[PDB]
Design an enzyme around this catalytic site. Sequence first.
Site, PDB file in Angstrom:
ATOM      1  N   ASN B   8       0.818  -1.206   0.000  1.00  0.00           N
ATOM      2  CA  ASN B   8       0.000   0.000   0.000  1.00  0.00           C
ATOM      3  C   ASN B   8       0.856   1.263   0.000  1.00  0.00           C
ATOM      4  O   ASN B   8       1.318   1.727   1.056  1.00  0.00           O
ATOM      5  CB  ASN B   8      -0.950   0.032   1.204  1.00  0.00           C
ATOM      6  CG  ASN B   8      -1.867   1.275   1.195  1.00  0.00           C
ATOM      7  OD1 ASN B   8      -2.034   1.927   0.167  1.00  0.00           O
ATOM      8  ND2 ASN B   8      -2.422   1.620   2.353  1.00  0.00           N
ATOM      9  N   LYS B  10      -0.093   4.219  -0.381  1.00  0.00           N
ATOM     10  CA  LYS B  10      -0.868   5.340   0.141  1.00  0.00           C
ATOM     11  C   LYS B  10      -0.716   6.522  -0.794  1.00  0.00           C
ATOM     12  O   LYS B  10      -0.623   6.330  -2.003  1.00  0.00           O
ATOM     13  CB  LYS B  10      -0.456   5.664   1.573  1.00  0.00           C
ATOM     14  CG  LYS B  10      -0.553   4.424   2.457  1.00  0.00           C
ATOM     15  CD  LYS B  10      -0.598   4.741   3.942  1.00  0.00           C
ATOM     16  CE  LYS B  10      -0.712   3.444   4.737  1.00  0.00           C
ATOM     17  NZ  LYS B  10      -0.634   3.612   6.219  1.00  0.00           N
ATOM     18  N   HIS B  98     -10.075   1.196   4.688  1.00  0.00           N
ATOM     19  CA  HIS B  98      -8.795   1.398   5.356  1.00  0.00           C
ATOM     20  C   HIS B  98      -9.021   2.360   6.508  1.00  0.00           C
ATOM     21  O   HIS B  98      -9.901   3.218   6.440  1.00  0.00           O
ATOM     22  CB  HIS B  98      -7.745   1.954   4.383  1.00  0.00           C
ATOM     23  CG  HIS B  98      -6.352   1.992   4.940  1.00  0.00           C
ATOM     24  ND1 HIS B  98      -5.930   2.958   5.822  1.00  0.00           N
ATOM     25  CD2 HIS B  98      -5.285   1.181   4.729  1.00  0.00           C
ATOM     26  CE1 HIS B  98      -4.661   2.743   6.138  1.00  0.00           C
ATOM     27  NE2 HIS B  98      -4.246   1.672   5.485  1.00  0.00           N
ATOM     28  N   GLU B 100      -7.585   4.808   7.496  1.00  0.00           N
ATOM     29  CA  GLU B 100      -7.388   6.205   7.178  1.00  0.00           C
ATOM     30  C   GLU B 100      -8.655   6.811   6.584  1.00  0.00           C
ATOM     31  O   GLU B 100      -8.973   7.978   6.844  1.00  0.00           O
ATOM     32  CB  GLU B 100      -6.189   6.384   6.243  1.00  0.00           C
ATOM     33  CG  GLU B 100      -4.872   6.346   7.005  1.00  0.00           C
ATOM     34  CD  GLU B 100      -3.674   5.894   6.181  1.00  0.00           C
ATOM     35  OE1 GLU B 100      -3.704   5.979   4.931  1.00  0.00           O
ATOM     36  OE2 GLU B 100      -2.689   5.431   6.802  1.00  0.00           O
ATOM     37  N   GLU B 170      -6.029  -4.076  10.911  1.00  0.00           N
ATOM     38  CA  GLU B 170      -5.212  -2.914  11.275  1.00  0.00           C
ATOM     39  C   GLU B 170      -5.272  -2.627  12.777  1.00  0.00           C
ATOM     40  O   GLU B 170      -6.314  -2.181  13.268  1.00  0.00           O
ATOM     41  CB  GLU B 170      -5.695  -1.663  10.539  1.00  0.00           C
ATOM     42  CG  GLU B 170      -5.922  -1.801   9.041  1.00  0.00           C
ATOM     43  CD  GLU B 170      -6.251  -0.465   8.403  1.00  0.00           C
ATOM     44  OE1 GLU B 170      -7.433  -0.250   8.035  1.00  0.00           O
ATOM     45  OE2 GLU B 170      -5.333   0.385   8.309  1.00  0.00           O
ATOM     46  N   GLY B 176       1.224   5.396  16.584  1.00  0.00           N
ATOM     47  CA  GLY B 176       1.271   6.689  17.238  1.00  0.00           C
ATOM     48  C   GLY B 176       0.933   6.811  18.716  1.00  0.00           C
ATOM     49  O   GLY B 176       0.608   7.895  19.222  1.00  0.00           O
ATOM     50  N   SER B 216       2.111  -2.254  11.472  1.00  0.00           N
ATOM     51  CA  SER B 216       3.483  -1.938  11.073  1.00  0.00           C
ATOM     52  C   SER B 216       4.268  -3.205  10.728  1.00  0.00           C
ATOM     53  O   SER B 216       4.524  -4.040  11.601  1.00  0.00           O
ATOM     54  CB  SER B 216       4.196  -1.181  12.202  1.00  0.00           C
ATOM     55  OG  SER B 216       5.557  -0.922  11.888  1.00  0.00           O
ATOM     56  N   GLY B 238       4.498   1.881   4.809  1.00  0.00           N
ATOM     57  CA  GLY B 238       5.629   2.656   4.332  1.00  0.00           C
ATOM     58  C   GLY B 238       6.721   1.820   3.706  1.00  0.00           C
ATOM     59  O   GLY B 238       7.361   2.244   2.740  1.00  0.00           O
TER      60      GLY B 238
END
Lengths: 255, 254
Positions: B8, B10, B98, B100, B170, B176, B216, B238
């Site tokens: 992904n 993003k 997702h 997000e 997820e 965070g 992650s 990422g």
Amino acid sequence: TRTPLMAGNWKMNLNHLEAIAHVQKLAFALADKDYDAVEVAVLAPFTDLRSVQTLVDGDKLKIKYGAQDISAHDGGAYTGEISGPMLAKLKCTYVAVGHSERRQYHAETDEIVNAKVKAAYKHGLTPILCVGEELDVREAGNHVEHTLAQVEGGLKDLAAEQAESVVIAYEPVWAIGTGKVCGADDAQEVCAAIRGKLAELYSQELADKVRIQYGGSVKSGNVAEIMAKPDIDGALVGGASLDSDEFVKIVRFRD
Amino acid sequence: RTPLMAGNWKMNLNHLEAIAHVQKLAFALADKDYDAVEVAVLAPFTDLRSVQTLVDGDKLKIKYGAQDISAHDGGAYTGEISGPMLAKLKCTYVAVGHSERRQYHAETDEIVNAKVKAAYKHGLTPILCVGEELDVREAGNHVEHTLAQVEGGLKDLAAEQAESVVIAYEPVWAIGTGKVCGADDAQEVCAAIRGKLAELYSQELADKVRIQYGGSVKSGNVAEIMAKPDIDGALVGGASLDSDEFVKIVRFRD
């Protein structure tokens, strides 16, 4: 005076092959006298922008292209979103921002749209700030007041050196997918006020350079009276942008 | 179950960088890599034609997909992208719901369920993303919530469609917060998820559905995670942008 801008908003239509064909169609039907007098743009689905760019670069077309939305952010953890840099690499000129459909189906706020307006300029794009009031506001007789605030909110913290090139599109949301029609006097009134509000936020020297489009239902029958108006400088076309002959006619609002 | 590694991206990579990525990717990968693992990249809309021509051109074994889909088949939906569009670009996958988009775009289980159906209507395979934020995890109800997310997402989907669906978990409570989601933590949920799929359909079906980890995922952790009996792949964030670290993940056995 201001070069009028005719932007065809395809919305969620046309795959990349159809996008290619449709833009070819347009280039076949339009002549040098057309691009010399009016600015022509198509706002294509994201997935179609590469195809339109290579064609536009390939056959050296004078037709501009742009996006229908932009992420407020420059990049990062924003799944599904398309950034300023991406649209810029595809060499888009415009991006519709704050379209009424997105304010409604996707809860876009003046604060969100303003951010998208700013992301556009940061990234060399020209936003088409879509504004307009719904039916309730029009019945209250406060329509301009609301539209005028929306323009201001959308234009928050934007320098005049950017704002000078901005496009505002007025969508009379009370009268588009609606049996109520917004006549050119009604739209001239808002588009005048809009230029008047811009004058306050900036300067009359700037306000007269800003193209203010009409965003109601625009067809070949409509396009003449709307365009004659002194403060209407183009049209953000809906359904009719998908019809080759009808878009070509609109570009020639000079019936 | 063929494991699935979906990268992904993003909101990253322009159309030429995207091509360079996939070129970099195919350069580093061999037949033995694809033989064991399914490789996909979920790229921004604007990158999809470029990836298609590259993949159709060089006959690549790497799949590609979208990060979103509109619930509608077409129409007056400014800025949204449809199944037919994604279908013409020959996408394989599309992420739906997702975290997000659930956070930034008010996507609900009801909206997510509609994208899942749309995905199937047009010959795409949805990757249904589910998961809980911090409060649900601290309440110890994460499994309860995630599972409601899975059932809501899959409503009115017949077994002949759902049997090919992919689920991605997820751990939103662990982005965070400083809090870590261990392979132990994730295995439990992906287990619960397969158990819920069995109820809604059958164990035989539930055993065919690949369930990804969507937390992650790094080269460092990928082995431990995959060695869990009910994790069948990873929805990589990422690190999917990093050719080398993505190639290691696809080669999680090493």
